[PDB]
Structure formats: structure tokens, C-alpha cells
From Swiss-Prot:
Name the record gives this protein: Nonsense-mediated mRNA decay factor SMG5
Organism: Homo sapiens (Human)
Function, in words: Plays a role in nonsense-mediated mRNA decay. Does not have RNase activity by itself. Promotes dephosphorylation of UPF1. Together with SMG7 is thought to provide a link to the mRNA degradation machinery involving exonucleolytic pathways, and to serve as an adapter for UPF1 to protein phosphatase 2A (PP2A), thereby triggering UPF1 dephosphorylation. Necessary for TERT activity.
Effect in UniProt of substituting D6A: Abolishes stimulation of RENT1 dephosphorylation
Coverage span on the entire protein: 855 to 1012 of 1016
Intracellular or extracellular location(s): Cytoplasm; Nucleus
Subunit architecture: Interacts with TERT, PPP2CA and SMG1. Part of a complex that contains SMG1, SMG5, SMG7, PPP2CA, a short isoform of UPF3A (isoform UPF3AS, but not isoform UPF3AL) and phosphorylated UPF1. Not detected in complexes that contain unphosphorylated UPF1.
Tissue expression remark: Ubiquitous.
Domain PINc: 18-99
Length: 116
């Protein structure tokens, strides 16, 4: 099963992603648009640690993690490449067309995490 972090998810909830990516129960696909978004943002210190963490997991030999409105739907395009995938952003409950794209779950990081 695939989880795909938002930039916001990585920037603000890195310890949730750490848990999930280390769980070994998921493969974490980090989309190119997110990875490149974080290079831009690393400013925001969330961005700088989002990347640094990701490289630390790479370094430690984690095989369960990879890199590969607008953002929301851009993950969609990267997700239909993998199409049980599942998207992790922030802004949970409260763009209606984005989620309406039928093949993939979008759940808030902490919503997914607390469910998990």
C-alpha cells in the first residue's frame, strides 16, 4: 500500500511520516513536485528537515520510501501512475473536485495517523 505525502504533510508532520515510513506497512512515494517544492522551500525549516529526514532514511537503508487545488491534483497525476494508493495532506475537514477524482483516498495526515 502506498502513502503519498503533501508538501504540507512533510513540512508540518514529519514525525507522523517517520512512523509510517518506518512502519514497513507502507511504501512512501514522495512525488517529484513535492521533492522539488521542498528544495525550493529549504525559509521554511519544515522543508529543510523534510528533506534531511528523507535522506537520513535513504542512508539507513529504508526501502520503503521513494521519490518519484493545483498541488492537490498534481499528486493525483503522480498517483494514477501507481494506480491501493492514499494521499496525505493538511487541511482535513472543511477543492471538492480534487477529492472527487475517484480512484485514490485523500486523508489528513493526523486523521490517517490517529486511525492507524
Amino acid at each position: 500500500p502506498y502513502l503519498v505525502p503533501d508538501t504540507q504533510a512533510l513540512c508540518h508532520h514529519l514525525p507522523v511520516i517517520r512512523q509510517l515510513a518506518t512502519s514497513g506497512r507502507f511504501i512512501v512515494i514522495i512525488p517529484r513536485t513535492v521533492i522539488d517544492g521542498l528544495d525550493l522551500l529549504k525559509e521554511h525549516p519544515g522543508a529543510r528537515d523534510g528533506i534531511r529526514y528523507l535522506e537520513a532514511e535513504f542512508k539507513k537503508g529504508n526501502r520503503y520510501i521513494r521519490c518519484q487545488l493545483y498541488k492537490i491534483l498534481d499528486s493525483c497525476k503522480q498517483l494514477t501512475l501507481a494506480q491501493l494508493p492514499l494521499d496525505n495532506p493538511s487541511v482535513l475537514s472543511g477543492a471538492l473536485q480534487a477529492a472527487a477524482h475517484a480512484s485514490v483516498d485523500i486523508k489528513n495526515v493526523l486523521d490517517f495517523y490517529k486511525q492507524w
